[PDB]
Amino acid sequence: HHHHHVTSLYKKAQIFVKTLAGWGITLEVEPSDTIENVKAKIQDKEGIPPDQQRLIFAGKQLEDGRTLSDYNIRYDSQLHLVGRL
Amino acid sequence: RDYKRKYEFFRRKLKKQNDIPNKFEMKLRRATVLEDSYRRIMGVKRADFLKARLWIEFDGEKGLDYGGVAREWFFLISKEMFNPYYGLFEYSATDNYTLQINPNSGLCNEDHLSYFKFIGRVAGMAVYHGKLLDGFFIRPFYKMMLHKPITLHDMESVDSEYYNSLRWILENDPTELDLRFIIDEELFGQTHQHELKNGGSEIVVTNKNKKEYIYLVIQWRFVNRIQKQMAAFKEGFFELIPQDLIKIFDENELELLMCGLGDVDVNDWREHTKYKNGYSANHQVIQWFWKAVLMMDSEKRIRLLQFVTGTSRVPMNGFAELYGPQSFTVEQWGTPEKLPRAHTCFNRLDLPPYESFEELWDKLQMAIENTQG
């Protein structure tokens, strides 16, 4: 929210992720990241716990061990967020 | 109009349980209502346990008004159950606020079906305890609950431009468009065709077989891919409400039976209110009256609505839709020593001209508490 934006301004230093609700946040990351820590990035921007998420690229449910490069994601790779149950 | 006699008979036919504890206990955290409500409720093998007076307590909060805390729960859980974020439900389209069972819910969550049953139980609970779920669903949903057919007509209210596309085909020659018996669907970025019948990809749509085309597209849009989910829902719902008892309502009534808003919008209420015998929108006493209604909570507002109209049913859409047809009225009767009184017959409040806001607040609140007896 406001905090996420303000914190970025002071960072020493683009992809989209959509939900079935209509809205979709846009994250900034480097493809070295795993799945686990990107869930945290969502925890930060929108206040959703990392447990409470399923991440899906190319219609395939994504694994924690692998990285973004290991699942061939690129700049502006559209991702999909649906709640865990 | 006959709904009043129907709803009376309905509740009179709804049998009380005589083998079940005095209260259904729920110990939930607001942060995790869905999880917490789901575990507790799907734990209970006998549905009847859920008919006990709902004793709900959030985050340790002790000794609050039982029927008011229920009100909150039904709202908050409805907010979570139906959140399209989860993929059980979804919006009928983009630029639509109404809801429908998501066909791909099982792709989203592998245990979608027990969650559907759960929602059914929670919905049947709402009914059983004369409370409502906060949900805008498409009429098809309510039709399917009565095992009633779906039609081309039904698509209009849901999607007009798509309805028009099929209406066009009904009235015109489709040869132009080189269509097949397939519908393409996008899910998680990927696109997929779906054959409407066996080998539908090879079958051209023509004048000779377009009425079949239209029919099949409807079933695919609304029925075929949500049978398992809707079944589950219906199972849970009928665990609490006998299906024979629900049969007396139609699809319109059945939205009024189980859906509605958990708070009365005040602007809407004020918009559709008449005044008699000196009172007027900018009259001082009327100014104070609405100040009160504004500064109530939803529970106090609904108790007031019952006091004056004789119901607690918030329809959605309008206070215009409030049946002869009679809207809310506020008339001057009596003196400040008299408490105000209502006439559910006329949807009318008789309000004496009080000295202050606080007098009006107190005298009114007492009068409502006098009907709680």
UniProtKB/Swiss-Prot annotation, chain A:
Changing T19D: Impairs ubiquitination by CRL2(KLHDC3) E3 ligase complex. The record marks H80 as: Essential for function. It is a peripheral membrane protein. Changing R66D: Decreases affinity for UBE2R2 in CRL2(FEM1C)-UBE2R2 complex. Phosphorylated ubiquitin specifically binds and activates parkin (PRKN), triggering mitophagy. Phosphorylation does not affect E1-mediated E2 charging of ubiquitin but affects discharging of E2 enzymes to form polyubiquitin chains. It also affects deubiquitination by deubiquitinase enzymes such as USP30. Mono-ADP-ribosylated at the C-terminus by PARP9, a component of the PPAR9-DTX3L complex. ADP-ribosylation requires processing by E1 and E2 enzymes and prevents ubiquitin conjugation to substrates such as histones. Residues 14-85 form the Ubiquitin-like domain. Signal peptide: none annotated. It is found in: Cytoplasm; Nucleus; Mitochondrion outer membrane. Changing R84A: Impairs ubiquitination by CRL2(KLHDC3) E3 ligase complex. Impairs ubiquitination by CRL2(KLHDC3) E3 ligase complex. The record marks R66, R84 as: Interacts with activating enzyme. It comes from the Eukaryota. There is a cross-link at K18, W23, K39, K41, K45, K60 (Glycyl lysine isopeptide (Lys-Gly) (interchain with G-Cter in ubiquitin)). Changing N72R: Decreases affinity for UBE2R2 in CRL2(FEM1C)-UBE2R2 complex. Changing H80A: Decreases affinity for UBE2R2 in ECS(FEM1C)-UBE2R2 complex. Impairs ubiquitination by CRL2(KLHDC3) E3 ligase complex. Impairs ubiquitination by CRL2(KLHDC3) E3 ligase complex. Changing K60R: No effect on HLTF-mediated polyubiquitination of PCNA. Impairs ubiquitination by CRL2(KLHDC3) E3 ligase complex. Exists either covalently attached to another protein, or free (unanchored). When covalently bound, it is conjugated to target proteins via an isopeptide bond either as a monomer (monoubiquitin), a polymer linked via different Lys residues of the ubiquitin (polyubiquitin chains) or a linear polymer linked via the initiator Met of the ubiquitin (linear polyubiquitin chains). This is Ubiquitin. It comes from Homo sapiens (Human). The lineage of its organism: Eukaryota, Metazoa, Chordata, Craniata, Vertebrata. The gene is UBC.
Swiss-Prot record, chain B:
Residues 46-373 form the HECT domain. Undergoes 'Lys-29'-linked auto-ubiquitination at Lys-338 and serves as a scaffold for recruiting USP13 to form an NEDD4-USP13 deubiquitination complex. There is a cross-link at K338 (Glycyl lysine isopeptide (Lys-Gly) (interchain with G-Cter in ubiquitin)). E3 ubiquitin-protein ligase which accepts ubiquitin from an E2 ubiquitin-conjugating enzyme in the form of a thioester and then directly transfers the ubiquitin to targeted substrates. Specifically ubiquitinates 'Lys-63' in target proteins. Involved in the pathway leading to the degradation of VEGFR-2/KDFR, independently of its ubiquitin-ligase activity. Monoubiquitinates IGF1R at multiple sites, thus leading to receptor internalization and degradation in lysosomes. Ubiquitinates FGFR1, leading to receptor internalization and degradation in lysosomes. Promotes ubiquitination of RAPGEF2. (Microbial infection) Involved in the ubiquitination of Ebola virus protein VP40 which plays a role in viral budding. Binds, in vitro, through the WW2 and WW3 domains, to neural isoforms of ENAH that contain the PPSY motif. Interacts with BEAN1, LITAF, RNF11, WBP1, WBP2, PMEPAI and PRRG2. Interacts with NDFIP1 and NDFIP2; this interaction activates the E3 ubiquitin-protein ligase and may induce its recruitment to exosomes. Interacts with UBE2D2. Interaction with PTEN is questionable according to PubMed:18562292. Interacts (via C2 domain) with GRB10 (via SH2 domain). Interacts with ERBB4. (Microbial infection) Interacts with viral proteins that contain a late-budding motif P-P-P-Y. This interaction is essential for viral particle budding of many retroviruses, like HTLV-1 Gag and MLV Gag. Interacts with Herpes simplex virus 2 (HHV-2) protein UL56; this interaction induces NEDD4 degradation. Interacts with Ebola virus protein VP40. A cysteine residue is required for ubiquitin-thioester formation. This is E3 ubiquitin-protein ligase NEDD4. It comes from Homo sapiens. The gene is NEDD4. The chain holds residues 939 to 1314 of 1319 of the full protein.
